[PDB]
Design an enzyme around this catalytic site. Structure first.
Site, short mmCIF file in Angstrom:
data_model
loop_
_atom_site.label_atom_id
_atom_site.label_comp_id
_atom_site.label_asym_id
_atom_site.label_seq_id
_atom_site.Cartn_x
_atom_site.Cartn_y
_atom_site.Cartn_z
N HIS A 21 0.80 -1.21 0.00
CA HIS A 21 0.00 0.00 0.00
C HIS A 21 0.84 1.26 0.00
O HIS A 21 1.96 1.27 0.49
CB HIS A 21 -0.95 0.02 1.21
CG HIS A 21 -0.32 0.56 2.47
ND1 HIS A 21 -0.16 1.91 2.70
CD2 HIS A 21 0.17 -0.06 3.57
CE1 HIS A 21 0.40 2.10 3.88
NE2 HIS A 21 0.61 0.91 4.43
N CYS A 22 0.28 2.32 -0.59
CA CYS A 22 0.90 3.64 -0.62
C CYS A 22 -0.21 4.50 -0.02
O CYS A 22 -0.84 4.07 0.94
CB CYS A 22 1.26 4.07 -2.06
SG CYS A 22 -0.07 4.06 -3.30
N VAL A 23 -0.46 5.69 -0.56
CA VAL A 23 -1.52 6.53 0.00
C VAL A 23 -2.86 6.33 -0.68
O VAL A 23 -3.85 5.98 -0.02
CB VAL A 23 -1.14 8.03 -0.05
CG1 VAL A 23 -2.34 8.89 0.39
CG2 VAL A 23 0.06 8.29 0.86
#
Length: 161
Positions: A95-97
């Site tokens: 995951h990132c943002v």
């Protein structure tokens, strides 16, 4: 949250609450590759370490590999990311943002290395479950490079005794 390979690897954006993390758990998530930088994580969790301990307290082994938004991992980071993702096959979440650029790049890279998919197939696959996956030219160039150096990446990932 979305799966690219049913229960083995998928991605998502930054969770806002612990309830969302538990939703991950219910969905089958077991390990978490955290790609956003400290300040991004802090926007929802105040402190990077606090976020990491929260994941750990919820049964998720986390690994933090900061990647600037729009960017790609450095080669050493990629090696670490890949050694980690390849160590345990089930329940990997990246995951990132927002869950599209950096995450789509890592996911596509994983498929390139593990399935030998050509760069365009890998990109198309991630884009089908997550539109917009892989955002920047830099990330597109990285992926082509992953395909080109597939053999060398694999050799370096498994350098053992």
């Amino acid at each position: 949250m979305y799966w690219v390979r049913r229960k083995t690897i998928g991605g998502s954006g930054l969770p806002y609450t612990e309830n969302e993390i538990l939703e991950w758990r219910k969905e089958g998530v077991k390990r978490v590759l955290v790609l956003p930088e400290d300040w991004e994580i802090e926007e929802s969790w105040g402190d990077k370490d606090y976020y990491l301990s929260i994941l750990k307290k919820n049964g998720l082994q986390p690994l933090h590999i900061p990647i600037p938004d729009g960017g790609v991992p450095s080669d050493s980071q990629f090696l670490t990311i890949m050694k980690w993702l390849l160590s345990e096959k089930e329940g990997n979440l990246v995951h990132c943002v927002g869950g599209i650029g950096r995450t789509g790049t890592i996911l596509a890279s994983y498929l390139i290395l593990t399935e030998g998919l050509e760069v365009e197939s890998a990109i198309d696959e991630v884009r089908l479950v997550r539109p917009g996956a892989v955002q920047t030219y830099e990330q597109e160039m990285f992926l082509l490079r992953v395909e080109g150096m597939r053999k060398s990446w694999l050799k370096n990932i498994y350098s053992n005794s």
